[model samples]
Target chain A: TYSYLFRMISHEMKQKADQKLEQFDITNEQGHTLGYLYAHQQDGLTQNDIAKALQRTGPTVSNLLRNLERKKLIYRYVKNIGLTTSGIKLVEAFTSIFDEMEQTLVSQLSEEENEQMKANLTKMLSSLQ
Target chain B: FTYSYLFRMISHEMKQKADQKLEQFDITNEQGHTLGYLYAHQQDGLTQNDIAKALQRTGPTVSNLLRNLERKKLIYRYVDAQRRKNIGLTTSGIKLVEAFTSIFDEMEQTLVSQLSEEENEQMKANLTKMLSSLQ
Candidate 1:
């Protein structure tokens, strides 16, 4: 019940990522939100979906997207709840930076272990989920 | 590779941004969160009710964040003619938007250094799915 290992690691990683992202003038949540919307163009989930997927409330998602839209990095379809062209572009642009930051995370484990991590985590999720 | 692991990695990057940008500020992520939300939707001048609805946060959480923002001189709360609790950005509030805005922009670059546009979004979407399972 008290797995501070995950929490501690998560907190440390979060702090590092937060510092790096700030130089780009983005929030951790904002970057994640942009990336989520751009990637999930298939189901085209509603605002509710965004909140649930992001482990946040509906209002949180609403607030996030609202701000992103204001920056002209994202936009909502008049009829659909998908991102506009600029939104896609912004997410695309930011992906490069995230890819680089991932290296440090990747270094945490070997390449072989990294690929195998999914299987291990799936086993863990059997009980956790 | 593992959704959870990668998710943690992404979160790490985000936390990095917060620490760097707010180092000199007196606000928490939640407090600034309120201002960001309000400023983003200032076209109509959002009310507390609207803010609550938009953030999907609890009334108390919103109240707490709002209290902090109000105390910081970042926002002004007043009773609109509609008898609803409306909020607006004060002169100080306007300045905060500029400050925080730059912080976020820089953070994006740091995280994007390694990944491509497509991969970044995929990672975000995948991690989002994982975050949902936690609840």
Candidate 2:
């Protein structure tokens, strides 16, 4: 049961989020990282923090950050801890758009269904965590 | 709002829906998940170990998953100066992710449709509580 719905939901979002970043010439990961960094800008998190927060590793974040740097979306400073003005702008621009996309998705939910899904999902993640 | 709890549900649902959406793209939910996480933080890429942690998967699993994504031209492996393995999405990877956004929109609609709006909102709130307790 977990696997079924999990698979269903997982695949569903990936397909769409994948499409949203097409125009930007970026990937879902890039968008996610931008969001994360924006949200945690106060931390100016190191590479390790980026990996841990994203549940990834330094190498991975390092690679993506490099690409983002090349694209002028982000800049690294202080021995691999960095942020760019453009990166923040990208986050703001994409977040406004993507969040709407997410809200449109939420619109599909009825109050009741959202309740059950959220409740059940909470339970599931709790158990797993 | 409990920050950790809040992001957990958002992140969790995001990953779940993401996986299902990627299925039609000929990728598994988990694979899409890994790629999604990596792609989202493109400027802040991750390593196999980090991906496993975020995805709650095994290291080898991510290792293998990375290989597959690479083979599919979704990502390429890059060795950093420090001998760490890194990944960057290929052009095709970017295209696939772009292609998948609408598919995800469809899936979210399907998920919300599974329950009433009140139930879904309450469910989201309930998830928030659970997330809080877990951390």
Candidate 3:
């Protein structure tokens, strides 16, 4: 039930992000992988690593990279993964939406409570993992 | 906007808060989940397989959880006429699940009350989309 509530709120935020990314014709999963790549472009991300991080299987991650490549959202460079020019810009928009939503969610709480909530949330998340 | 990141935090923090409350019962958060599921289905006799199916868990995983609940005397498994094992909650299990849901009810209210009725509806629309993307 707790997860259901969070899922609902998450669903709401993702819809808004979709509208922003709809122009680029990327699904949220695709956008997500691209965003991951955008952040770890220099970290030598492997397909298996992405699979584990995304909690998806090899075939799924394989299909993800294949489609993203077709969309020109990502590319390979000397065994390292890289985001395309448009991909970098897209994730910038993605981060913008993400940060804005985070701000809005925390706005419901006081500044002190916000800090406490974030810390508590991180602890809980780590424990759950 | 990375619904995965935000939702994981919210759900897990809520879980941890509830887990602390349930610590008196000496049950884990997900173990509480199994008891609650038993409380939900009144008519159909549920088997371990049914639980694993409904909860979207593996057989051995639910097996371990069910075993824990049984040791706590919260649940019991009985053989049916058809020779299949069915799961049911005990009185203690029912009471525990009621309290567990009540705790979640507090969180549900706290979250929903954060906005006006209209604000939540619009927000609800967005959340559905966000989870859809993440899902």
Best by DockQ: 3
Report how far off residue A69 is in candidate 3 (Å): 1.0
Better of 1 and 2 by TM-score: 1
lDDT (tens digit, per residue) of candidate 3 on B1-135: 233474656665766677887777787877877787789894689999988998899999999999988988889988988768999999888888887678777766666665567755655555444345444
- Most accurate candidate by TM-score: 3
Model 3: colliding residue pairs: A11-B126, A11-B127, A11-B128, A11-B130, A11-B131, A12-B126, A12-B127, A12-B128, A14-B130, A15-B130
Q: Model 2 over residues A17-122: C-alpha lDDT tens digits? A: 5676666777888888887878887756787888988998778898988888888877667755555887777777775544754555445556665555556555
Each prediction's total of clashing residue pairs, residues at least 3 apart in sequence or on different chains, is 48, 82, 10
lDDT of each residue in A26-80, candidate 3, tens digit only: 7878877997887776778888878888899999989999998887888876656
DockQ-derived CAPRI band for the predicted complex in model 1: incorrect
Model 3: residues with Cα > 4 Å off, grouped in runs? A1-11, A14-23, A43-57, A96-129, B1-12, B98-135
Query: Candidate 2 docking category?
Result: incorrect
Candidate 2 chain B, poorest ten consecutive residues by summed lDDT: B126-135
lDDT for A61 in candidate 2 is 90
Evaluated at residue B35, the lDDT of candidate 1 is 77
Ranking by DockQ: 3, 1, 2
How does the DockQ of candidate 2 come out?
0.03
Ranking by lDDT: 3, 2, 1
